Amino acid sequence: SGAALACLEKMQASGVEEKCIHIFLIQHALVRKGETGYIPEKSISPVESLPFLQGIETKGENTALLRQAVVLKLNGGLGTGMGLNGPKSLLQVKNGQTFLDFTALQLEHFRQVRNCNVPFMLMNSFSTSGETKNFLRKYPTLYEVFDSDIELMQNRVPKIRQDNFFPVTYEADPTCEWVPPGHGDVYTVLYSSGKLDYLLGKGYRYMFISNGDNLGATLDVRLLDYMHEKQLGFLMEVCRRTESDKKGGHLAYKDTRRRFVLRESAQCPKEDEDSFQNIAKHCFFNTNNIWINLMELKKMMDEQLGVLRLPVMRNPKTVNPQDSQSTKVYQLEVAMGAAISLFDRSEAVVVPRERFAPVKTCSDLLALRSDAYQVTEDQRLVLCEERNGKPPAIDLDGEHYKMIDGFEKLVKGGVPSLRQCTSLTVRGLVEFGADVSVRGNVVIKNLKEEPLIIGSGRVLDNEVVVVE
Ligand SMILES: O=c1ccn([C@@H]2O[C@H](COP(=O)(O)OP(=O)(O)O[C@H]3O[C@H](CO)[C@@H](O)[C@H](O)[C@H]3O)[C@@H](O)[C@H]2O)c(=O)[nH]1
């Protein structure tokens, strides 16, 4: 393959890790022959039941295990879905505090309260590393050990043309020619960097990993205790899916014994969107709060010669995400949750919603920035009590609010109160002013060209607003 050799040479020219190149060209072979990465509804069965955290946990903690624990926050994605060209963690959340402020403050609270200097890492990509490093100047505790201790630099892979599978060229911005290969990349990065051997040599055996956008994620020593007692290599936290869980992955089963499967958004064929979005059928949603046993990982990686068989997802895009007329490409990516079938002993457990405040979209961001979410003593962000575990279901017009620039007009004059909101749908150009209270099920449709301004102090109480 001339296309594979072209990818090979371009990767080697940019300093890409040898095993990553090898794993990529494996996937490249597959996709060149029309591998879609899809998990069709007819290939899987729903997960009907799972153990709950209240059941499986006990009183008391084994502090000896916490002493073996290490935290990693994922920070490598490009946030292209929200129209970013860099780290979504540098987005403001509350009080002029970004996602990364909340992460740094959470860690500091954890270390203080428990008097335990738990190791901490951020998995960065080429697109997020520099901005993240400079941001952390504000946290000298982290900054002074950023290169040596904190950063885990993941790999990058070229975007490849949908027609001939060659790496794409984009002269206007050669930066658009590359993508981090998914958070699934973590295992090979840990292995090939020497970080895994380093951590194991200091006696660490467990790693807690969560999304950089999820400020609800918590190191639970009682869940750690459980994972260890059942001698698990991998534990995934899931939530009872809500109407707001539209993007990410749900669990399912495949057969002749049953094994877990993770079906991501990118693995769902167009014809199956309705099923993928049936929250009652596919009711267990991955939080991406994942515990791994590091020695089990080490043993697997050695066994499989640095090459985990994670399922490749073949993500179609344009080379410049913002320009729909730019060259059509495929991003080959893996998800860290897909290791759930690869570990010898793995489990998923249902956790309370207060451990999962995701921001995948500007609709999610709206909910987080609003009074629907609250800061806890331990510096987490958690859904308010009166929403009874169910985030407001926010549908923001994809033609106006998908890009952060468009979302910016909506909240420019004010983030509305959403703590009493079960549902908010916005269509056309719309602009909130100050101290707007949204209550119950609210619809706002503007059919005029002029933005619809929602006056300051307006109460929208189970109301449908249509301006024409
Ligand atoms: O190559 C990459 C790609 C993403 N990220 C980071 O990974 C985290 C999550 O990525 P994101 O695109 O926000 O989420 P998805 O990958 O679509 O979904 C994940 O998060 C959902 C929970 O919000 C789960 O339901 C999914 O199964 C899980 O794969 C964020 O910190 C990203 O910055 C990386 O570090 N490297």
Query: How many whole angstroms from 247 Cα to the centroid of ligand 1?
Result: 10
Whether residue 230 is annotated as binding a ligand: the answer is no
- Counting from 1 in the atom list of ligand 1, the atom nearest the Cα of 214 is 23
Which 3-state string (H, E, C) describes the chain?
CHHHHHHHHHHHHCCCCHHHHHHHHHHHHHHHCCCCCCCCHHHCEECCCCCEHHHHCCCCCCHHHHCCEEEEEEECCCCHHHCCCCCHHHCEEECCEEHHHHHHHHHHHHHHHCCCCCCEEEEECCCCHHHHHHHHHHCHHHHCCHHHHHEEECCCEECEECCCCCECCCCCCHHHHEECCCHHHHHHHHHHHCHHHHHHHCCCCEEEEEECCCCCCCCCHHHHHHHHHCCCCEEEEEEECCCCCCCCEEEEEECCCCEEEEEEHHHCCHHHHHHHCCCCCCCEEEEEEEEEEHHHHHHHHHHCCCCCCCCCEEEEEECCCCCCCCCEEEEEECCHHHHHCCCCCEEEEECCHHHCCCCCCHHHHHHHHCCCEEECCCCCEEECHHHCCCCCEEEECCCCCCCHHHHHHHHCCCCCEEEEEEEEEEECCEEECCCCEEEEEEEEEECCCCCEEECCCCEEECCEEEEC
Q: Experimentally, how was this structure solved?
A: X-ray
User: Which protein residues touch ligand 1 with a CB less than 6 Å away?
Assistant: 74-77, 88, 123, 125, 154, 180-183, 185, 211-213, 247-249, 262, 264-265, 285-288, 335, 337, 358, 360
What is the sign, positive or negative, of the torsion defined by CA atoms of 256, 260, 265, 271? positive
Q: What are phi and psi of 352, to 5 degrees?
A: -60, 145
Of the chain, the end-to-end C-alpha distance in Å amounts to: 57
CA distances from 69 to 65, 121, 213, 362 (A): 7, 12, 21, 33
Q: Cα(211)–Cα(286) distance, rounded to whole angstroms? A: 11
Whether residue 177 is annotated as binding a ligand: the answer is no
Query: How many whole angstroms from 419 Cα to the centroid of ligand 1?
Result: 26
Whether residue 435 is annotated as binding a ligand: the answer is no
Burial of 291 (0-12, 13-18, 19+ CB in 10 A): buried
- Counting from 1 in the atom list of ligand 1, the atom nearest the Cα of 213 is 31
Whether residue 88 is annotated as binding a ligand: the answer is yes
What top-level class would CATH report for the domain 360-468? mainly beta
Q: What is the resolution of this structure in A?
A: 1.9
Pocket test for ligand 1, best of 98, 211, 317 (most atoms within 8 A of CB): 211
Closest CA to 417 of 375, 461, 467, 447: 461
Pocket test for ligand 1, best of 17, 24, 74 (most atoms within 8 A of CB): 74
Query: How many whole angstroms from 361 Cα to the centroid of ligand 1?
Result: 12
* The two three-digit tokens of residue 115, written as one number: 């008097």
In this structure, are strands 178-179 and 157-158 parallel, antiparallel, or unpaired? antiparallel
Residue in the structure block whose two tokens are 């639970």: 220
Whether residue 390 is annotated as binding a ligand: the answer is no
CA distances from 368 to 99, 250, 372, 411, 417 (A): 10, 22, 7, 13, 11
Common-topology check for domains 1-359 and 360-468 = no
Kindly report the protein residue whose alpha carbon is nearest to atom 24 of ligand 1. 248
Query: How many whole angstroms from 211 Cα to the centroid of ligand 1?
Result: 6
Q: Cα(146)–Cα(254) distance, rounded to whole angstroms? A: 42
Is 235:350 a contact under the CB 8 Å cutoff?
no
Pocket test for ligand 1, best of 288, 312, 341, 364 (most atoms within 8 A of CB): 288
Extents of the domains making up the chain: 1-359, 360-468
In this structure, are strands 373-375 and 346-350 parallel, antiparallel, or unpaired? unpaired
Give the residues across from 209 on adjacent strands: 72, 290
Query: How many whole angstroms from 183 Cα to the centroid of ligand 1?
Result: 6
* Fold entry, domain 1-359: Spore Coat Polysaccharide Biosynthesis Protein SpsA; Chain A (3.90.550)
254 is catalytic: no
Is 399:441 a contact under the CB 8 Å cutoff?
no
